[PDB]
A = this chain, B = another copy of it.
Amino acid sequence: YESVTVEVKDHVAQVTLIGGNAMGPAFWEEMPDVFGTLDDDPDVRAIVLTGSGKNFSYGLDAGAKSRSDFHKRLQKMQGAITAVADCRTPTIASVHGWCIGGGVDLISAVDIRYASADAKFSVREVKLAIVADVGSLARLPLILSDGHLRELALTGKDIDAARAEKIGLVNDVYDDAEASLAAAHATAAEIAANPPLTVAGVKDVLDAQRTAQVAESLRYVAAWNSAFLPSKDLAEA
């Protein structure tokens, strides 16, 4: 693969994103294949997801006929993330550094989130004159509450790891990158020491409770952005 690295050891695979880890066309083309490959063979029972370098990611790098094609690309981009959100092997994210835009759309589709002390988070589509349509606003309501989500989505500001700990976006915070990565690996091993059919069944039962809302919200946002996205304020900044 030209956008990630995969290394498996002792029933846990680690998956690293190498690209400031910007997500381009190769990302959207490749993620479903990587996660389908990892979720098939029985040698893997849990996955750890981390980013290369000193950050996690920076985000993303007319008439009806031209807008239909935009609609189709937007749907494919949505499917690339729904691929990770519907896998039956548990995933743990380990976040160090910066996490902007599309990266936030990615860590809202994993099961567990660990951070370090120098981590910063934002949802910065509104500052670009964009209404986010990849999965942030469809899946963040199960993680956060109304007021914190509304402030984050309407202001476009940055928050640190202590506030993200307090509002519920991450489970734990540690001093450095290596401590958080070790904690994530310890939890992954703890999960991999259980029976695998029972784990997949728990995941199935929990996922059966939330699919319709996410699908409906994604449909509506694709239509809205196909209507109102391209404008002058998109070029004004």
Q: A168-B147, A202-B153, A205-B220 are in contact. Are A228 and B197 (CB under 8 A)?
A: yes
* Assembly CA distance A157 to B190 (angstroms): 9
CA distance A148 to B143 in the complex (A): 10
A84 to chain B, nearest CB (A): 14
Please report the C-alpha to C-alpha distance between residue A198 and residue B220 in the assembled complex, in whole angstroms.
15
List the number of copies, as a whole number.
6
Closest to A71 in B: B227
CB-CB < 8 A to A112: which residues of B?
147, 150-151
Which residues between 111 and 153 of chain A lie within 8 Å of chain B, taking CB atoms? Answer: 111-113, 125-127, 129-131, 137, 141-143, 145-151, 153
Measured between beta carbons, the chain B residues less than 8 angstroms from A153 are 202, 206
CA distance A221 to B127 in the complex (A): 28
Of B137, B190, B232, the residue contacting A155 (CB under 8 A) is B190
Taken together as a complex, chains A and B put the C-alpha atoms of A100 and B129 apart, in Å, by 39
Listed stretches A5-13, A14-22, A23-31, A209-217; interface member? A209-217
Tell me the minimal C-beta distance from A150 to chain B in angstroms.
Answer: 5
B71, B90, B127, B155: the one contacting A154 at CB < 8 Å is B90
Besides A64-B228, A129-B195, 12 more A-B contacts (Cβ < 8 Å) are A64-B197, A65-B197, A65-B231, A112-B147, A131-B205, A143-B145, A155-B191, A195-B233, A197-B228, A204-B224, A208-B217, A220-B220
Q: Which 8 A-B pairs have the closest CB atoms?
A: A227-B227, A64-B231, A223-B223, A226-B227, A195-B233, A129-B195, A131-B201, A212-B212
**Interface set of A (CB-CB < 8 Å, partner B):** 63-65, 67-68, 71, 90, 111-113, 125-127, 129-131, 137, 141-143, 145-151, 153-157, 168, 170-171, 187, 190-191, 194-195, 197-199, 201-206, 208-209, 211-213, 215-217, 219-221, 223-224, 226-233, 236
